[PDB]
Design a binder for these strands. Structure first.
Length: 76
RNA sequence: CAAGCUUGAGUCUCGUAGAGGGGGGUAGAAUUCCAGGUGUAGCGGUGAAAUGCGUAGAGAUCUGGAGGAAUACCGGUGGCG
């Protein structure tokens, strides 16, 4: 569920996937953070144990809200 | 029982103070909500937490608007009934 995002990420390099599924390739964490920032989105570590770790560009708050919404609705 | 009397009780005149009652207007503070600008990962809550709220961008800040309810200071063994 919970993913670490943005500056919480410690990986030197990550494989980057953008908000639409475009495979941006291997990028330094710094460049990945720049791309996320220019798009006003977050850099989310979706696959911490992949080699190299996989990050997805997305709105973390919107993603998390929808996930919690889904869980709650299906149980009431 | 009858006539009275003016001190009890009323009436008259002119003023005074008052959150006394009923109706109608209207005001500025705040909360919550709606619409936006800035901003970004927390806010909120407790003894400690969690539920809750926030990347569909909250909270914080600035702006405009809606609505309801109550009227800080004055304010006080103050006042009115």
């Amino acid at each position: 569920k919970d993913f670490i995002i943005n500056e919480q990420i410690r990986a030197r390099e990550v494989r980057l996937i953008d908000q639409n599924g475009d495979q941006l390739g291997i990028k330094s964490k710094q460049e990945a953070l720049e791309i996320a920032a220019r798009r006003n989105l977050d850099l989310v570590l979706v696959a911490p144990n992949a080699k190299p770790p996989v990050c997805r560009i997305m709105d973390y708050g919107k993603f998390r809200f929808e996930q919690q919404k889904k869980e709650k609705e299906a149980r009431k």
